Amino acid sequence: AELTPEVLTVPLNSEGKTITLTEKQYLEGKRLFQYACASCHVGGITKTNPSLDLRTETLALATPPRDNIEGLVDYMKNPTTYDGEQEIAEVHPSLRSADIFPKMRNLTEKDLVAIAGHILVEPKILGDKWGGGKVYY
Amino acid sequence: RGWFDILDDWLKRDRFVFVGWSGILLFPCAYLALGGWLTGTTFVTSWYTHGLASSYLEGCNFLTVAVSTPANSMGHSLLLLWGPEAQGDFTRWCQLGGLWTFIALHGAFGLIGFMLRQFEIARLVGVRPYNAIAFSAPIAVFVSVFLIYPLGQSSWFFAPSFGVAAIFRFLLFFQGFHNWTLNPFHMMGVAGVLGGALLCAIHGATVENTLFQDGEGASTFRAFNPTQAEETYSMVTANRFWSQIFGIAFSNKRWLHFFMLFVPVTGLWMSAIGVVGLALNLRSYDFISQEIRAAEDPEFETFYTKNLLLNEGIRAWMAPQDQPHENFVFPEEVLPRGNAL
Amino acid sequence: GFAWWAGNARLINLSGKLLGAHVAHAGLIVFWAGAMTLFELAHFIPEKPMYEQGLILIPHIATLGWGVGPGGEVVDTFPFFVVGVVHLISSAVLGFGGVYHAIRGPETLEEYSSFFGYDWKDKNKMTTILGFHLIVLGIGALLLVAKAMFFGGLYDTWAPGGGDVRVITNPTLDPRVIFGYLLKSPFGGEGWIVSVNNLEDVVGGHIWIGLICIAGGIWHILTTPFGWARRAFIWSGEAYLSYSLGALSMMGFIATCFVWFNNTVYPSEFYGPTGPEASQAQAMTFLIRDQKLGANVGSAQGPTGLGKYLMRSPTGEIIFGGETMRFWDFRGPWLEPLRGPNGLDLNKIKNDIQPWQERRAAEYMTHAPLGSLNSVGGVATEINSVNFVSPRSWLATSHFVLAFFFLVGHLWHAGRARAAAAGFEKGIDRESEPVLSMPSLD
Amino acid sequence: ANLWERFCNWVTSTDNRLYVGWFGVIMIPTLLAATICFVIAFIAAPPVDIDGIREPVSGSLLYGNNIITGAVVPSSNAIGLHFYPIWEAASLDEWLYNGGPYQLIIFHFLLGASCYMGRQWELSYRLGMRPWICVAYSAPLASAFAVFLIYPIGQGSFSDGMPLGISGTFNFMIVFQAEHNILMHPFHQLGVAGVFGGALFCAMHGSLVTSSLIRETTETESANYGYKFGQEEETYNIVAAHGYFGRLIFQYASFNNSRSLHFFLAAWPVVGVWFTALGISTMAFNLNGFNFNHSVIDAKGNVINTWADIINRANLGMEVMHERNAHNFPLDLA
Amino acid sequence: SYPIFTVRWVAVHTLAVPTIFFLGAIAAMQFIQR
Amino acid sequence: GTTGERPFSDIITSVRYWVIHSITIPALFIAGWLFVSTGLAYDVFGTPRPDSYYAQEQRSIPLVTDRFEAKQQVETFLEQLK
Amino acid sequence: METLKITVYIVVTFFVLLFVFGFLSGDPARNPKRKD
Ligand code: CLA
Ligand code: CLA
Ligand code: CLA
Ligand code: CLA
Ligand code: CLA
Ligand SMILES: CC1=C(/C=C/C(C)=C/C=C/C(C)=C/C=C/C=C(C)/C=C/C=C(C)/C=C/C2=C(C)CCCC2(C)C)C(C)(C)CCC1
Ligand SMILES: CC1=C(/C=C/C(C)=C/C=C/C(C)=C/C=C/C=C(C)/C=C/C=C(C)/C=C/C2=C(C)CCCC2(C)C)C(C)(C)CCC1
Ligand SMILES: CCCCCCCCCCCCCCCCCC(=O)O
Ligand code: OEX
Ligand SMILES: [Cl-]
Ligand SMILES: [Cl-]
Ligand SMILES: [Fe+2]
């Protein structure tokens, strides 16, 4: 098996437009996910709040839907709680809060797309392991 | 003065590496066991027998490579290259696990070879055959663990796999399934191995710190000559030291050195016996009286009950991936887990 | 009579060549200090906490007030470069004197100069060298005072508003405080000297130590050992080596516990959270999460009957629940605002927890000093992903190992010095074996 | 005739059936205290709340244990690293509930064992021996320090030190594997090589010497009677033994210097056991065994399990089950 | 006058020849990418 | 003392020795190297290549479940990648 | 409990003084060869 374009194809937005990443974008996303996110989100879980994970199906049910590149890029700019009711930039890394989360300072717009793409690809590669936690190690 | 005696003449010539009649068995078999291991750990997968990568070629390191056991579905097949499983195909032989039987069986005849060599050289040089006798413990361990144990089980699949991490998995399997730490035959083995290392260290340290001044150098190694008659350290002073320090000491150099043979050899033999029991699942798993009390009395708790909870965790969390032929599917809700973890 | 593998023992009575070994080796220490700093600098990325980057030297420099501002943010990397370059440059000078005295200089010194030459058995001369070095050491501890009080201050993690560099204007001199630490128990809630938690006490302690070392130094230049000391000790080079190995061992073990428990002179901003800190931060984190969802964390009973979030310590203080009950002696700047007189204050917990505290707890919980030898971060069952081992784990383990071996070296060289001084280090004389002139035990 | 000097003469006398010495003046009372308290507690101590969760564990014989399951149980996690002498308890009842005896025994024992090592130095000096037997003993001594004191200091609680019992020991070593992956740690691997090798070389050396004993006896008597205590002549023939072992392997892999040989015997296990004590001592600060969990993945990114991932499944089952009531939050951080 | 080809010669080369070859195969492996 | 073979320290400080072995040692190293770089090692031993542990939309192990049909089973799995 | 505490302080002090004073009472000289 291999990293075919089919797997690198993920939704761009809620309107079911798609976008096909490069193997390059995906490895860059993975690298950037380990840099800025995995201390909390290793394997697609959330160490500081295990009830919310990065499984596509969970993101799909977030308000603003987050199972797409746009939702996730926006999330990395202006994160909200899962129902969209409050902004959590002050306790969650984001470009909006890069004064207090300095790893976010040097992230470009293209980097955000790669991170979002990584998050959306990985459960296609890993299945239940992505966000499933230690049961699946 | 016929051919047999001439060949004897030649096999027993004094050379850098002695050959002997035993060499005919030993050297082929040792070299093949060892080449099979190096070959398999460098190039051969365990994908079809175990669902595991296991060679340098696949991305493993020295701790995780292994020559892994055949699939459970092979039973105790000898898995000869020309046998009905591989049907002479070398590649499929490798993929079905044929290198495991190859190494195990050539390894066993090499071990015989090696002990015959200790007998052969002992006889030519004119000494008593105790080194050979002692090596019976390594042989007992090897056959009981790599041969007798999987023969009582369902297949070679549950033998140890030849690899560093693979042997670690075998340690943990035996804890979780057999409660082998509770087995008094393992406990006597532990005492013999740890008793051996103690005796090794304490005997070396004693000789080196009761040396006779036999030279003038600060390096005391020069002041020994292998053909001197005289003892090179004081048994009298050594005996006094230990008598005053520990209560009792050795006083007989012969008993001392026999006991150093006796202690680790006996311990290894004892552990071999308990593994023979585990071949049959004849475990020292439980204490009945403890279980009766705990079943009736939920405030009763010992380190013994605490360890079985750990065993039960080991079994359920490792069995699906460690025994893939069984198709265990444990939904999340059935996994034993304490709070939070 | 020594073999090649004991070949430096050939130097015991070659004071010139032995001076060269000591000074060449002094140059390697300084070389490493310099080279390593520049290596860390060339790798340093200021957007990343120091402790996500494998730094052990830059944290020592920043702790001293150089390079950093409020919150431990790095503002200026030039001070680090300077410290590296100067150490690097200085090691060539020690290198130079080292190999000159080891290869070319006079191999013995006592014919060339009665001041620099010494005999190990010369007790007056030995205490004089000891005295000089005691003064040097006292000067050095006063340089730390000078920095704190007259040349910019020190980093103070406890400073209000996230920590900052602070000039120390009232160093503690009260000896009931300073020597009070020496007499605290090393057990939990006490911590002997590892519990020093404020820079006033740190600086004042160094005024005392500097004055004591200078006074001690002058004392040893002017005196020779009293007869009771003359009869207590072995007076030989190897014996003095053995004394100092023991002292290095003691100090290595203390340094181990310092970097593991102390978050004042090893701020968690640079070194990462301590083990107790990280574990306290986990309970804090989930107290916050759960209270935000509506949980009444004070009244929530856990599985055992003890509080799920909050319980009492054995002396009554309100503390975090779960296994971290064991770490309730922990104190840190992010946590102290919640402490009232009876321990954690339930009304501050409900009303006054700040976003920066929530951030800090989350950060410290996810950077606990747990990791594998190949630097996979987190518990031992964690998958690969995070490349992190805490600097505190690195600094604790390394110095435990070194302290252990220096204790072995102490016993090695001490027992040998005793034996060599009595004349039986090379073995038992066959013609005068002491046990053969003793009566049998039974 | 001076009283102090007479007492000094008796303390350090080489005529006492057991050497006392200055190290013995501390070792004798501390070891007697630790022994007397250990025996009493093993037989009769009531259950101890080791993990601080008011879930007491029964360690003693009279409360339903046998020799294998019995233990003096470590002190309560509620105590942590706090000093808990008898006089800090409101009563013996309290002190027993909370695990006080464990502290008394291990502190007294570690002190007495430390002095045991010094006593080994001291008598060597009074007898005019070389001094380094005690250095050999520092290997087992460092190992007991590691599991009774160092590992507790790093994890923050004497409740995670090694129980003083047979099944308690196994509990400690299973939980250590789940929390540190000790088997994948190279210092434990050197310890196994130190202990395996020590047993190997013990047997080797014993068998080579036994093999080359010089006929001094008949077949009706134990050969051990061919050696008389304090005879000057060696009792075996090292050249015949070197000539056998050099041929079993090859010549230059065999010792004919008996001094080098016995030094090798001393140094191999001692050094291996130094390392494994250092392993426990450094896993005390959570620098754990190699982690190759999911280190092999395929061209797509599928995880390709290895024997290390199988180890990890076993480690997980230990992790999730141990101290099953004691964790409220998702990471076992200590 | 020493011989060149001996039983020793064979023991040595019986191990050294495959070792170097195996070291070459294993060094190539460090450059395999997934 | 000796059994009449030429001492090793004489052999490896000798010029003829290194004349032969500066060729034989690198050649062997390069041979083993080519064994892997050509892919031949994979095909000889049957070791999966990184792209052939699974098929694209498969996550089952291709585990041998039969003793006497086992060779046929492996071949079946291998076809399911082609 | 205080009677106990004080008793133990005294016992321990007594033994530690024996130890310190014993090793200060010319211990290098208590060997069988060169006494000084
Ligand atoms: C002393 C050396 C020695 C020993 C003891 C063994 C032992 C073994 N080998 Mg190993 N092997 C060796 C050398 C040795 N091998 C060498 C040198 C090589 C390299 C060529 C190999 C390569 C090798 C492979 C590739 C395999 C083995 C296998 C085996 C096993 C099965 C052997 C078998 O069934 O033989 C059957 C044959 C005999 C027992 C010989 C009996 C002959 C008798 C004395 C005479 C009978 C009459 C004769 C046939 C008349 C001729 C008739 C003709 C004119 C028509 C066994 C453990 C197999 C294995 O490990 O399975 C896992 C396997 O696949 N070996
Ligand atoms: C301030 C520290 C110090 C000093 C100055 C000395 C000085 C001395 N020692 Mg002591 N020693 C020390 C600490 C010290 N030691 C410690 C901590 C120990 C315990 C480990 C010892 C144990 C010890 C023993 C056992 C002996 C001495 C001896 C000696 C003398 C000869 C030493 C020699 O030639 O080494 C020469 C150097 C070597 C042989 C090299 C050793 C290499 C080490 C073991 C490995 C280091 C590898 C490193 C960890 C990483 C490598 C990475 C890789 C790329 C290479 C000399 C007076 C001898 C003696 O009694 O003299 C009278 C002797 O027999 N030493
Ligand atoms: C920190 C490490 C250290 C240091 C500083 C020393 C220093 C010394 N050793 Mg020891 N030694 C060491 C490690 C060390 N040793 C170890 C690890 C071993 C075991 C292998 C030994 C074994 C050993 C033996 C066996 C002996 C010594 C001896 C000596 C002394 C004389 C050596 C001599 O004549 O050199 C001669 C060597 C040369 C002329 C070759 C060149 C050496 C130079 C110094 C290299 C430096 C290069 C450097 C890059 C230049 C920078 C210069 C620039 C700053 C201007 C010297 C003081 C000897 C002694 O005690 O004499 C009585 C002696 O016999 N040593
Ligand atoms: C503690 C280390 C040490 C010690 C004890 C000695 C001792 C000695 N050296 Mg050596 N030397 C050393 C280090 C040391 N040196 C270093 C580091 C170098 C290279 C710079 C040299 C280079 C050297 C040479 C080239 C020669 C000596 C010679 C001598 C002898 C006489 C020197 C004299 O007359 O004083 C001279 C006194 C002064 C110049 C007074 C000024 C005070 C100093 C230089 C400034 C203070 C430095 C400060 C305290 C620390 C550094 C600062 C830094 C932390 C930033 C004497 C035995 C001579 C010899 O052996 O000939 C037979 C000789 O020719 N030395
Ligand atoms: C590197 C430091 C150093 C060294 C090696 C020495 C070495 C020496 N000193 Mg000097 N000393 C120093 C620093 C040092 N001194 C300083 C800074 C001062 C000024 C305060 C002095 C003041 C001083 C005086 C006033 C005297 C000495 C004397 C001596 C000699 C006997 C020492 C002795 O037996 O102590 C061993 C210690 C004892 C026998 C009893 C005290 C034991 C301590 C308190 C127990 C604590 C153990 C505990 C576990 C450690 C934890 C900390 C503790 C506070 C709780 C010896 C040559 C004596 C001498 O002959 O001078 C000419 C003497 O009378 N020293
Ligand atoms: C199986 C088989 C066979 C056989 C084969 C062989 C016999 C092989 C061999 C092979 C070989 C024979 C191999 C080898 C290899 C080797 C190697 C691979 C090595 C390596 C090593 C190393 C790596 C080391 C290193 C080191 C270190 C690490 C440290 C210490 C030091 C040193 C340097 C040593 C046959 C044909 C019969 C057929 C069937 C199958
Ligand atoms: C800086 C600082 C500080 C302070 C400190 C100090 C002030 C210290 C001191 C300390 C000291 C003050 C030390 C001590 C020491 C001591 C010791 C360590 C001793 C030892 C002893 C010995 C070793 C002895 C021995 C002997 C005997 C017993 C008998 C006879 C013989 C002899 C002599 C051998 C503080 C914390 C505040 C804070 C931070 C900083
Ligand atoms: C006692 C010594 C026994 C020596 C055993 C060596 C065996 C030599 C290996 C020969 C393997 C050839 C098998 C491949 C061809 C099989 C084809 C078929 O099954 O019809
Ligand atoms: O205590 Mn004994 O054991 Ca070391 O972690 Mn946390 O804590 Mn408890 O759990 Mn896992
Ligand atoms: Cl448990
Ligand atoms: Cl918890
Ligand atoms: Fe011996």
Swiss-Prot record, chain A:
Reported phenotype of the disruption mutant? Cells do not grow photoautotrophically under low CO(2) concentrations.
Give one GO molecular function term.
electron transfer activity
- Give GO cellular component annotations, separated by semicolons: photosystem II; plasma membrane-derived thylakoid membrane
Which Gene Ontology BP annotations are present? photosynthesis, light reaction; respiratory electron transport chain
What is the protein's known function?
Answer: One of the extrinsic, lumenal subunits of photosystem II (PSII). PSII is a light-driven water plastoquinone oxidoreductase, using light energy to abstract electrons from H(2)O, generating a proton gradient subsequently used for ATP formation. The extrinsic proteins stabilize the structure of photosystem II oxygen-evolving complex (OEC), the ion environment of oxygen evolution and protect the OEC against heat-induced inactivation. Low-potential cytochrome c that plays a role in the OEC of PSII.
| Quaternary structure and interacting proteins, as annotated | PSII is composed of 1 copy each of membrane proteins PsbA, PsbB, PsbC, PsbD, PsbE, PsbF, PsbH, PsbI, PsbJ, PsbK, PsbL, PsbM, PsbT, PsbX, PsbY, PsbZ, Psb30/Ycf12, peripheral proteins PsbO, CyanoQ (PsbQ), PsbU, PsbV and a large number of cofactors. It forms dimeric complexes.
Tell me what this protein is called: Photosystem II extrinsic protein V
Q: What is the lineage of its organism?
A: Bacteria, Bacillati, Cyanobacteriota, Cyanophyceae, Acaryochloridales
Residues included from the entire protein = 27 to 163 of 163
Swiss-Prot record, chain B:
Pfam families attached to this UniProt entry? Photo_RC
CC cofactor note: The D1/D2 heterodimer binds P680, chlorophylls that are the primary electron donor of PSII, and subsequent electron acceptors. It shares a non-heme iron and each subunit binds pheophytin, quinone, additional chlorophylls, carotenoids and lipids. There is also a Cl(-1) ion associated with D1 and D2, which is required for oxygen evolution. PSII binds additional chlorophylls, carotenoids and specific lipids.
- Protein localization: Cellular thylakoid membrane
Transmembrane intervals: 21-42, 98-120, 130-149, 183-206, 255-277
- Main localization, broad class: membrane
Q: What keywords appear on the UniProt entry?
A: Chlorophyll, Chromophore, Electron transport, Iron, Magnesium, Membrane, Metal-binding, Oxidoreductase, Photosynthesis, Photosystem II, Thylakoid, Transmembrane, Transmembrane helix, Transport
Q: What Enzyme Commission number(s) does the record list for this chain?
A: 1.10.3.9
Annotated residues that bind chlorophyll a ChlzD2 are located at 106
Q: Which reaction does it catalyse?
A: 2 a plastoquinone + 4 hnu + 2 H2O = 2 a plastoquinol + O2
Question: Which residues are exposed on the Cytoplasmic face of the membrane?
Answer: 1-20, 121-129, 207-254
Q: How does it sit in the membrane?
A: Multi-pass membrane protein
Q: Which GO terms describe its molecular function?
A: chlorophyll binding; electron transporter, transferring electrons within the cyclic electron transport pathway of photosynthesis activity; iron ion binding; oxygen evolving activity
Q: Which PROSITE patterns match?
A: REACTION_CENTER
Quick one: which residues bind a plastoquinone?
203, 250
Enzyme kind, highest EC tier: oxidoreductase
InterPro entries, alphabetically? Answer: D1/D2, Photo_II_D1/D2_sf, Photo_RC_L/M, Photo_RC_L/M_CS, PSII_PsbD/D2
Q: Which residues bind chlorophyll a PD2?
A: 186
Q: What GO CC terms are in its UniProt record?
A: photosystem II; plasma membrane-derived thylakoid membrane
Q: Which residues bind pheophytin a?
A: 118, 131
UniProt topological domain (Lumenal) ranges: 43-97, 150-182, 278-341
Record-stated family? Belongs to the reaction center PufL/M/PsbA/D family.
Q: Which HAMAP family match?
A: PSII_PsbD_D2
The primary gene name is psbD1
Swiss-Prot record, chain E:
Q: What cofactor does this one take?
A: heme b
Q: List ligand-binding residues for heme.
A: 13
Keywords attached to this Swiss-Prot or TrEMBL record, sorted alphabetically, are: Acetylation, Electron transport, Heme, Iron, Membrane, Metal-binding, Photosynthesis, Photosystem II, Thylakoid, Transmembrane, Transmembrane helix, Transport
Which GO CC annotations does the UniProt entry carry?
photosystem II reaction center; plasma membrane-derived thylakoid membrane
Report the domain of life of the source organism. Answer: Bacteria
Compartments it resides in? Cellular thylakoid membrane
One GO molecular function term of this record is:
heme binding
Record-annotated membrane-spanning stretches: 7-31
Record membrane topology? Single-pass membrane protein
- UniProt topological domain (Lumenal) ranges: 32-34
- Write down how the cofactor binds this protein: With its partner (PsbE) binds heme. PSII binds additional chlorophylls, carotenoids and specific lipids.
Q: Chief location of this protein?
A: membrane
**Biological process annotations from GO:** photosynthetic electron transport chain
Summarize the subunit comment. Answer: Heterodimer of an alpha subunit and a beta subunit. PSII is composed of 1 copy each of membrane proteins PsbA, PsbB, PsbC, PsbD, PsbE, PsbF, PsbH, PsbI, PsbJ, PsbK, PsbL, PsbM, PsbT, PsbX, PsbY, PsbZ, Psb30/Ycf12, peripheral proteins PsbO, CyanoQ (PsbQ), PsbU, PsbV and a large number of cofactors. It forms dimeric complexes. Part of a photosystem II (PSII) assembly intermediate complex PSII-I; crystallized from a strain deleted of psbJ, it forms monomeric PSII before addition of the oxygen evolving complex. PSII-I includes 3 assembly factors not found in mature PSII (Psb27, Psb28 and Psb34).
Family membership noted in the UniProt record: Belongs to the PsbE/PsbF family.
Protein name per the record? Cytochrome b559 subunit beta
Curated annotation (Swiss-Prot), chain G:
Traits of the deletion mutant: Decreased yields of PSII dimers with increased PSII monomers, slightly slower photoautotrophic growth, about 20% less oxygen evolution. Formed PSII dimers are stable.
Cytoplasmic topological domain residue ranges:
25-36
The record's annotation in InterPro entries points to: PSII_PsbI, PSII_PsbI_sf
Is Transmembrane a UniProt keyword of this protein? Answer: yes
Instruction: Mark the transmembrane ranges.
Output: 3-24
Q: What is its main location?
A: membrane
User: Which terms does the UniProt entry file under GO BP?
Assistant: photosynthesis
Keyword vocabulary terms for this entry? Formylation, Membrane, Photosynthesis, Photosystem II, Reaction center, Thylakoid, Transmembrane, Transmembrane helix
In which compartments does the protein localize? Cellular thylakoid membrane
Q: Which Pfam families match?
A: PsbI (PF02532)
**Looking at the UniProt record for this protein, which Gene Ontology cellular component terms does it annotate, in alphabetical order?**
photosystem II reaction center; plasma membrane-derived thylakoid membrane
Q: According to Swiss-Prot or TrEMBL, what is its membrane topology?
A: Single-pass membrane protein
Manner of cofactor binding, per the entry note: PSII binds multiple chlorophylls, carotenoids and specific lipids.
Q: Is this entry keyworded NADP?
A: no
Protein function: One of the components of the core complex of photosystem II (PSII). May be required for formation of PSII dimers but not their subsequent stability. PSII is a light-driven water:plastoquinone oxidoreductase that uses light energy to abstract electrons from H(2)O, generating O(2) and a proton gradient subsequently used for ATP formation. It consists of a core antenna complex that captures photons, and an electron transfer chain that converts photonic excitation into a charge separation.
Protein family per UniProt: Belongs to the PsbI family.
| The protein's name in its UniProt record | Photosystem II reaction center protein I
Give the organism the record lists: Thermosynechococcus vestitus (strain NIES-2133 / IAM M-273 / BP-1)
